[PDB]
Structure formats: C-alpha cells, structure tokens
Amino acid sequence: DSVIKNIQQFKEKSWQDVSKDDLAKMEEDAGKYGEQCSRLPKDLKEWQAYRDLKNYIDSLREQLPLIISLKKPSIMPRHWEKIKEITNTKLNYENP
Amino acid sequence: QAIYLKELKQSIKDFTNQVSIFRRDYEKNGPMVEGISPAEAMERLRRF
C-alpha cells in the first residue's frame, strides 16, 4: 500500500511542476524508490500483490543514470526524434 | 458470588465456540491463498 500510494502521490506534476532535468526531483523520487527497492527484498512468501509491487519498481538501476542526462535542455525535439528512431520506439514517435 | 461464577462459566463456554467459528471462517475467507483479489484484500484483512 505505502509504495503504491506514494507512486500515485506522484503521477500528475506538469513539466513546469515536475523537474526531471539534471536536478530531477522526480529522479530523486526514483532514488527514493531505489531505497524502496532496497527494502523490497523479502523472502516470506511470493504474493500476487508482491510481484505487482515488484513490477512497479524493479531494474531501476538502469533508469537511475539513464535519464539524468537524457532530460537536459541538451535534449531538443531533434534529440527526441533521435531517441524515437534509434530506439525504434513508437513511444516518442507518438509523443516526442 | 456464586452467580458470578456461573456467569464466568457461561462466558467461557460461549467464547470457546466463538473461537471455533472464528478459526472456521479463516480457512475459507480472506487472506488464505484462494483467488486473485487485486488489492482489495486490505478491507477484509482490516475487518479481520
């Protein structure tokens, strides 16, 4: 419950509200979720809700340094282009 | 003093079968691993 309701406490900040660029308060939230993952491991039992939580916050060790510099003003819509094409992801094709 | 002893008696007697129906509700209802129950289990667990 706690992990999830914090994840929902942040889902709505706008680009001016959410600072994700080079001093990213939300990538700092993602480091807070990295320590949430530091508390994630527990071998009492595997639950559906447990693996749901795990799927919500796992492999963030690559998210951690991926986007810190992927969010600078360095990233211009032409760089958003470059991302969508070279990653071959329709995600930034539909929304750069 | 005696009628209080008999009150204590009937109290223990009814509390025993109360605990019985308690443990019997447990195995079929709630946190026992039976179905998916996506993130609703908190309500029934709190009522428990």
Secondary-structure map:
This is part of a larger assembly, with two copies of chain A.
Chain A (H helix, E strand, L loop, with lengths): L1 H8 L15 H15 L8 H9 L3 H7 L10 H11 L2 H5 L2
Helix pairs in contact in A: 2-4
PDB class: structural protein
Keywords: cilia, doublet, axoneme, outer dynein arm, dynein, structural protein
Entry title: The structure of the Tetrahymena thermophila outer dynein arm on doublet microtubule
Order of helices and strands of chain A: HHHHHH
Beta fraction of chain A: under 5%
Distance between the termini of chain A: 33 Å
For the secondary structure, the number of strands of chain A is: 0
- Count every helix of chain A, treating DSSP H or I runs of 4 or more residues as helices: 6
Main β-sheet description of chain A: none
Which structural class do the helices and strands of chain A define?
mainly alpha
Outline type of chain A: globular
Oligomer: part of a larger assembly
Q: Which chain pair has the greatest contact?
A: A-B, 5 and 5 residues
The share of residues in helices of chain A is: 55-70%
The Rg value of chain A, from CA coordinates, equals 16 Å
PDB class: structural protein
Keywords: cilia, axoneme, outer dynein arm, structural protein
Entry title: The structure of the Tetrahymena thermophila outer dynein arm on doublet microtubule
Chains A, B: Dynein heavy chain, outer arm protein
Notes on the structure:
The structure is cut from a larger assembly and holds two copies of chain A. Chain A has helices at about 1-10, 25-40, 50-55, 60-65, 75-85, 90-95. The first copy, chain A, has about 100 residues and is mainly α. The interface of A and B includes residues 1, 4, 48, 49 and 52 of A. The PDB classes it as structural protein. The entry lists the keywords doublet, dynein, structural protein. The structure of the Tetrahymena thermophila outer dynein arm on doublet microtubule. Chains A, B: Dynein heavy chain, outer arm protein.
